[model samples]
Target: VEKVFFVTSPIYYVNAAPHIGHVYSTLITDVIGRYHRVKGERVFALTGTDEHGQKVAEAAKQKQVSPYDFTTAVAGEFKKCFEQMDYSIDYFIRTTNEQHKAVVKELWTKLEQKGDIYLGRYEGWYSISDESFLTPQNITDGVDKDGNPCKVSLESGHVVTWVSEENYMFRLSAFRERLLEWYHANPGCIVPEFRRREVIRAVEKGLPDLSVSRARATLHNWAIPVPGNPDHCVYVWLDALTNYLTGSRLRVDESGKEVSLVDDFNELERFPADVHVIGKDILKFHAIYWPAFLLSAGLPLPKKIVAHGWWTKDRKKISKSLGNVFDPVEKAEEFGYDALKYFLLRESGFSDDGDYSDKNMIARLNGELADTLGNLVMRCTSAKINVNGEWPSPAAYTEEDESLIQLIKDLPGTADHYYLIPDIQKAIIAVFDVLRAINAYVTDMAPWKLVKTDPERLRTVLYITLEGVRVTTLLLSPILPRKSVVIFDMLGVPEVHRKGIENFEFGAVPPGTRLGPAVEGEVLFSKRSTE
Candidate 1:
């Protein structure tokens, strides 16, 4: 059977607009989705807003409007944000949607029928900001506004309050053995060995029964009610996590009717998502609680839960109250979307956090994009060299030429391995390494000098360099979807030849192969500076 690829980003809260952290999750998923397409796999990438929670309710009260109205407006803004970033999400789900509510109720009923859920009293620390039900061990000292010390949720550092109420609880303790067995059996299901270690320690220590619902009184009546129990509402985490399964195998059709997402069965299947791209902040919810729910419900687990690091502003967590937040749409406007995407991927490491600075952003843009890549493409494809306006024919090969040729041929396979590891950072480095090699070779061989003195030898040098760009462009296309096309157009890469990485074999650009129009200085990417 043909392989199918499904990727998703966490459906975020509609109370606040997106920041760089939000964009990073979706960008990597988008790049992965695009990468799989290059490998000729079916892909469906899902993302949307988590609109139901105490946060949305509280923010709605501030706006002096109904919760639905407030969430509706904010969801619209996120949709706009994604549009500006050109994300290739296949389906956008809202937690408040009628369909989502139905799905939540359906799953809740299943858990209840299985006797995993029961009505009980819930008394513990619950943070409205984090929407997390915390154990005593999960609490830590922190300072609230005005510098008054307070107890906060350890995971998020948000103030926590003790709550006592009647709600439905899931017998999560029963699954401790099962969860551990699954974890032990599948040691690498979660990326970044460190995150997996944290999850294992949590489950191994002890599993507590989880409160799966909130009292309507406490919720102020703005939540999904438990099926057959109107006084209680489903827990916000349960409601949000269900968004994954909700979009997995269902979709809307062009004729405005409901349909199974199977027309392209092998092409796209979000069921048992191939990968779930998310921030490390919510690792427990996705890695632990979510799996327990699926096991109890008898559904296939997501193939991989890839937890990546956070983006901080100058060593401080980005916060709206602190006035250090970045709106992705605005940033994308300031720096072109392609440059923004490249900078984010190149600078990020899968296992740790990174600080954001305009100085660093500009440096990456100028150094890697304009100076390294821009000049290489412009200088290589420019009219000064390869004056014949066609692919070069080589008379004889040198050891240097052979070495570069082997790297180009081996790149697609090497980069594909990292892409599957779902490590965008290393995958990017793999591709960029090839580009830097070509840049070094460009200087050493002096293609400019060879153009006049040894035009015959220049043919072999140009062939090798141009092939590097072709492969590099193909490898980076998923990362730079919009701008990479211009390189292909400039290189006269016809639609037929640029299908997938496999098609661009070594020596694919035959002698006398027609090159496109002559490229001028920096046509591919322009430089940016503080000036």
Candidate 2:
């Protein structure tokens, strides 16, 4: 079994509560990671907050508490949010943790020893909100990727920080050509298709001046101390990226002991990450800066940097000031947890901004979930119960029946390709296609008609449709895990199953396995009445 090192959406700067924009990215990662585990890979999924930052310090101050205390409270809230969302995160990395500090310090020293770090004079326009410096060119007034005004632009009342000598810088420019070439050769290294183009375009234009290591006195000195220089902290982006390693046990352990940062125990053999899912806003850090940091330290570059898109509300960018942020917990309660989860994946395509609206959510729940998929569930189970409450035997293959079965059996592969692209929408639509077809097939076969004279034929129809349901549930498991589990159990499929990756086959429920008692559950979905 190949080892998998999955990461959740990077922890947000703990300066605000998590809204839908934050959870949108995290949800995609959780869905993908869950799928990987179901497929039986030795997988590790880690996510947490970046506690040590200027924004965090400022936020803490407003709360009349120490920076550490403020972040601790907010971090607990962040963890609780994910728990409530049903995320199966393996590790939660807080940069303020003593363990993370050790890991960051070790990495600092390694980079410094490699001469990737240098004490240099730094001067630039800095955005406190982003905790990042920006060039005049870096500041833009145009619409953001989500078609919303840039939040950073709102804080244009920027401050200039003189990062004098005694601050370290990583030699990111040194690997520009190599990084660009790697991205070009591995065109699929990024996901959603468009984000890759964005990165390549940025690279082709020219790699900008990268400021890596930072000094503490220049900024708030709350972060990991630069090795051999306690006066400054590592740059926020660099330090935060390092958490991906620390969280995965890819670097030093909590006690500062060297441990496998890579999934493979053999450090020499396995070091490069298979993939790193990140938000598009941080694409440059992950794609360019991170790869260069790895090269400078003589470590393998991550194989892929999957940059997903952002989120918006009312077809408008979610704004903190607008008070339009979707409260994730509240949304979960208002919409059923599983419904919310499914709504999110279907609403937004991976690597693209999706409009968050009640209309869109209800449309999906009604059309796909209720009218199409729910109707199929009712027709099959009710018919099965009416017959003998036993699974029907599939008859000899008809062109149509064989075609549907082929599609069903081939679901894992088709879905896995979308998974490779990190296209959550593609996977969602794949299941939707199966749903649409089986519903149409039912209408054509007219199982309701067969029940009167052709009872045995009706049994065959239920058998085939139920079998499709079986395959559909498995393929859709990653997106609607809880619902899929319920469907599987209701259909008598075991919960524990093998991996469902590109090459792995989705095993059908055993032929002749005794199903549980017929569940007269509420309709899985309901048709929309005219508003």
Candidate 3:
């Protein structure tokens, strides 16, 4: 079997329109998926919307629309948002889709067969905003923004109300010891090490049976009804979490029809996802509850769960209530998506919260991109020295030429190291380090002066410079794909070289490679005004 690399972003809840926070998670998944593909691995990238829940039902009623209509419209907007941002998602699964619903129902039956699921009364503090049940220990008296008395979840500060109903419960407490064993067996399964420790400690604290369904009369017609009990609806998280499997098993045809998801036995082999990329806020679900449910269904647990922190705007958490949420697509449009992609990974350290601002973004764009990388390309590909507009073969190697060659040669190994670990920020920084070195090299060689003093030496200098840019563009393609493709075409990088790293030899752009006169491209990133 071919090695498969499977990754997914948590299915976004369609209660509201997407913002930068939502975009951040999906972007992380996209980068990882692209990296593996460039490494010559078969990759499946999944992302979509969670369209069923009390939240969706309520939001629709407030808007005087049916729940299905509200969810369908918002789901369409979510798909559009990802496209506008250039996300290459393989599957855009919606919970309301028949395939997903069927998968959820099958999973429920499997859990019941294992006796891990049973009917029970659920009496607890339920947080509507979080769509979760909270224990008494995690709930406390608190005041809302309006100073009204309310009970709130200590974990999320969302208001919770006491509720009692007959619901189906999953025996999650049965998996505590097994979960610890799984964690011990897979040390790096959760990235950033510390996040794994947090999850293990939470499991050690103690597990409880999870309320997995709501009385149908209370939840109304907004959820998947239980197989045998029409009066019960599967909880939103249970329904949403199964989307990963539902999406994986599906095959889309040329005409865009979705093929069998459950009937294909071969599809079952796709389990044991390589990684589940999620935000820190939802780590407990992916890390704990989802694994237990899969265990009950005789399914393989994912290989890893990568939890990332949130993005803050101007040093404060972005909130729709605060009127601080920004449009990610619009931001990408203003500065170019490649610039936005670079800034996001460069600014945000993996596994930590990042602060964002217009000022910071423009600074990185001018300092790193336009001033360093873009300027290097234009200078090397300029018509004055590179008269033929073709790749030049270097003459006998000088000490400086060899030194620059050695540095360029070391980049693929260094970058592949980070990309293998799937650390995008580090991978990008590895490329930037080469760009910086090349900048210094240009200053030392003084190619412009050499052109006048010794024309033959000038050709060597220009060849080396263009060669460095060619290799750098290939290395950075997964992150800044559009810009990289443009640069590759300008340098006449061939189709084979653009596909994988197998052709990524140091002197891949050998001498006599025909170059096009008059490179056709605009300035990559113009410095933005701080209006």
Give, for candidate 3, the lowest lDDT window spanning 10 residues.
Answer: 262-271
Candidate 3: clashing pairs of residues: 390-515
Candidate rank order under lDDT: 3, 1, 2
lDDT of 3 by residue, 458-486 (tens): 77888888878888888788788899887
lDDT of each: 0.83, 0.70, 0.83
Taking the tens digit of each residue's C-alpha lDDT, what string does model 1 give over 1-531?
345588999999877767787789888889999988887778878888898878789878988999988889988888788888997777788888777787788889889888899878888898999888888988999998678988998788888989999878999999999989888898778998889899999999998899999988777788899899898888999999998888764676764233653322223445788899999989989988999999998877887889999888767778888888766677778888988898788887789787778888888888888887888887777788868777787768899888888888888888888898788889889887888988988999999999889998898899888888988888888999988888888777777667565565776656777777753434666767685
For candidate 2, give the lDDT of residue 368.
84
Clashing pairs in 1: 42-267
Worst 10 residues of 2 by lDDT: 154-163
Question: For candidate 2, lDDT tens digit of each residue in 1-531?
Answer: 244555456777898776675677677778777877767665666678888877788777777888877888888888888888887666667787776677677777788788766656557556777676666665545454366654243334334332334446667666779888888888888775777787778777766456665666545677777777667777888889877666655454555334444443344232355667777777777877877777777666676677766777787767778777676678767656778888888877765677778777778788888787777776776743346655766666678877877777777778878876677788878878988889888998898778787877776677878778877777777777777776766666655542344323433555565555554555554454544
What's the TM-score of every candidate structure?
0.94, 0.89, 0.95
Q: After superposition, how far is residue 177 of candidate 3 from its true place, in Å?
A: 1.5
After superposing candidate 1 on the true structure, give the runs of residues whose Cα lies further than 4 Å from its correct spot. Answer: 1-3, 143-149, 254-268, 518-522
Name the candidate, 1 or 2, with the larger lDDT value. Answer: 1
Positional deviation of 307 in candidate 2, in angstroms?
Answer: 1.6
Model 3 segments beyond 4 Å from truth? 255-257, 262-265, 517-521
